[PDB]
Write a protein that binds this ligand. Structure first.
Ligand code: GDP
Ligand code: GDP
Lengths: 431, 40, 431
């Protein structure tokens, strides 16, 4: 029954992974003990995608929790829903990665990886028909970045015919001052380009700017940043968790969204944007929903969608609304904004509508775009990487772990190639 | 910056807790047969 | 024209190799400058087997001289024929192998091997039709044993379809007190069993006993020991160096002598045994030669031929003598001593007669026997090896070079297997 295995690695991966489970649990009527208490049958129809049914009619997330930082286990277990997670699915080390990709990928991470693979093997074999995997992690640290990409690679060896999907948090010096974050992110992107089928680019630069400029928060905290992350993750997974026709599984989503294998980095967006504690006085109209979710101020990646073209788009509308009005509005943005949509992929914008809205909203909309403007995110990381790399800055922290400088050169070149490929398709014409 | 620190009296022999000097770090960051005919 | 490439490694290999060249150059009428001044066309007919013809009608040995020990190049170059050798064919290193097989095979020897391979490649390609290779070396030291067996293995990779022949000096505590010699010899035998086509076992135990008991030398010197070595090497290479019907090349010798690939360790014998400076008052008769070359007191390996069976034998008579009398004597020793000859290999004793005798002798005889009694030599080494190996004695000198203890176990087991194979054929019947 199309099961997904969820994996959360590192401090960021576990923080956003926990919020994902707290949020989707509420939507499905599942309390922290695993009991169901809802009104709608749509809540449990596809509960199997993310939850295992344990004895006593309980539901337990098909989630594996990983971190080299031992202290992460306590913070996850102490969360509102820490009780729901399978105890044996918590795999924690004693020595962290110290913001070092090489430690997470090659040394401390490699020491712990077989313990994680044992637990993913067990969840995977228990599946009636496994779809693939979903990894939440950051790219700026050491565990989520290095060990997360090591896990992806090992999982790909045993399950090569399954979808590998990630929620990858991109670093921004606006939220983190760690000097080596561009190194860790470039090394991770190199891995993601080769080994994932679809990746959602949750950019800390866009999240900080949404909180500061749009939500008017003088100093956004990780809670503020993560409110946007969970709201995004709920929206982008709605099609997988509820009964529907379009993009109902990770494979059908990838066939619709990815025309060229490497070009699988999605720009997520949502509407209405809200802060924690902001009440909704009235529901947005379908034209407000459609206009806002396509707005650059609503994107979760710091890229201007009007600086590129949309290869493909998935629009998900949640709540009770007119489908005729939705269709009209979706045709309206494409006909009015025709120059930001590739003309050589006919009917590249697919729209789904789910009757169940998210918490505190009567109407909402989530956007998923595969845009050539995503090169703005990669160019920003590449520039930061190059500034340090030309000075051979901080390399001993990586080569001291056994790494070769040639790996940095290879990763830089691969990400720069990815950027040229987006530009090639942006300039392509339907001759 | 290494230069201005040195002109302001920075100790070049100063070792960190890993037993490394500043120049040891920059070096760490930076990354045959010879036929000799002999008369007898 | 059936060329042989000669290689001499280590202090023993170079000492024995120089004596080989001094002896066969005298037999072929070649002086230390490479000029010919002989009295028989038989001396020049097959000169090409061991000598290259340089410009000016000069003859130069197709010999490569190798050592890791500092100071050895001068002693070789200063020898009676040191100037005949090709200057570029001398490969002498700075750091010796310190009686350590691991140092000669894996570390110092491996650092010098490509320089030797360059020089063997050049001699080999210059060959109109290369037969194979001949290596002189000891098994008790570090260079001849370790580097000699490394050379054999590398030469086998480039010239797998060529004959690999060796004159391997076995160690005896009667002539050397080095504690590790059984280790070096066992590690070398393991290599020889797999990688040579034919090996002449020149045993220092037999050489010392011949000098002491038969020649009446209170304290045999290496010169005394090598006087027997040179006499043997001259005799067993006669068929290769002079015109004849039998065993005229290394390959035809192997087809006649080796029934089973691993059983290629020969026990050489020669008659008459003499010391340096002993004049021959009268030439021996054909029955005296036949009786003596087959006698245990005339064997160059410390094995009793009446404790095993002869799989194959090559007898070479040198001098002017009756061929009818030689044939009669060869049939008589086989019919009188029928129980020491395998009955399942019909006509296994081949006899050649060369008109040219060795220096200072009117008549001589050389014996090459592939006898199952050679297991006495291997058992003696195995017992010495085991006494130290069970105590894990001196292993750090070998494992300190990167070696694994498992390689000692593998070598011991292989040599013990070789001994069981000789015993199996010793007990075989023509049922
Ligand atoms: N959005 C978000 N980013 C986070 C969070 N925690 C850490 N990060 C980012 O992740 C990076 C550091 O990686 P982290 O997950 O702390 O390291 P790891 O434990 O070694 O995987 C930096 O770019 C942080 O700004 C979080 O809760 N939310
Ligand atoms: N017959 C004979 N044996 C020798 C001679 N020189 C050394 N050996 C033996 O060879 C062994 C030592 O090996 P050696 O050739 O000296 O060492 P290498 O230079 O490391 O190869 C001991 O068993 C010695 O008795 C020699 O001139 N004649």
């Amino acid at each position: 029954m199309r099961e997904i295995v969820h994996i959360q690695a590192g401090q960021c991966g576990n923080q956003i992974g926990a919020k994902f489970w707290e949020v989707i649990s509420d939507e499905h009527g599942i309390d922290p003990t695993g009991s169901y208490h809802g009104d709608s049958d749509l809540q449990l129809e596809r509960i199997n995608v993310y939850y295992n049914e344990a004895t006593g009619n309980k539901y337990v997330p098909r989630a594996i929790l990983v971190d080299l930082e031992p202290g992460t286990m306590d913070s996850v277990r102490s969360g509102p829903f820490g009780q729901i997670f399978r105890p044996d699915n918590f795999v924690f080390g004693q020595s962290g990665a110290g913001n070092n990709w090489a430690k997470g990928h090659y040394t401390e991470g490699a020491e712990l990886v077989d313990s994680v693979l044992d637990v993913v093997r067990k969840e995977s074999e228990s599946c009636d028909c496994l779809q693939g995997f979903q990894l939440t992690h950051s790219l700026g640290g050491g565990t989520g970045s290095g060990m997360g990409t090591l896990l992806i690679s090992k999982i790909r060896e045993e399950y090569p015919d399954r979808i590998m999907n990630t929620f990858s948090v991109m670093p921004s010096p606006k939220v983190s001052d760690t000097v080596v974050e561009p190194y860790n992110a470039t090394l991770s992107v190199h891995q993601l380009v080769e080994n994932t089928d679809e990746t959602y680019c949750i950019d800390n630069e866009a999240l900080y700017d949404i909180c500061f400029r749009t939500l008017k928060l003088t100093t956004p905290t990780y809670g503020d940043l993560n409110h946007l992350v969970s709201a995004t993750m709920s929206g982008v997974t709605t099609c997988l968790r509820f009964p529907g026709q379009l993009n109902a599984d990770l494979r059908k989503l990838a066939v619709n969204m990815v025309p060229f294998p490497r070009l699988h980095f999605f720009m997520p967006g949502f509407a209405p944007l809200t802060s924690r504690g902001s009440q909704q006085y009235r529901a947005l109209t379908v034209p407000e929903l459609t206009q806002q979710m396509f707005d650059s101020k609503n994107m979760m990646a710091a890229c201007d969608p009007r600086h590129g073209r949309y290869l493909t788009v998935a629009a998900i509308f949640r709540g009770r609304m007119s489908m005729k009005e939705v269709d009209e509005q979706m045709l309206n943005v494409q006909n009015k904004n025709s120059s930001y949509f590739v003309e050589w992929i006919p009917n590249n914008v697919k729209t789904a509508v789910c009757d169940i809205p998210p918490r505190g909203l009567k109407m909402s909309a989530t956007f998923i775009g595969n845009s050539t403007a995503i090169q703005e995110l990669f160019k920003r990381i590449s520039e930061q990487f190059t500034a340090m790399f030309r000075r051979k800055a901080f390399l001993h922290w990586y080569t001291g772990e056994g790494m070769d400088e040639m790996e940095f050169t290879e990763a830089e070149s691969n990400m720069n190639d990815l950027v040229s490929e987006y530009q090639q398709y942006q300039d392509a014409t339907a001759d | 910056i290494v230069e201005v620190l040195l002109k302001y009296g920075a100790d070049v022999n100063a070792q960190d807790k890993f037993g490394k000097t500043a120049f040891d770090i920059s070096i760490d960051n930076g990354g045959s047969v010879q036929i000799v005919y002999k008369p007898v």
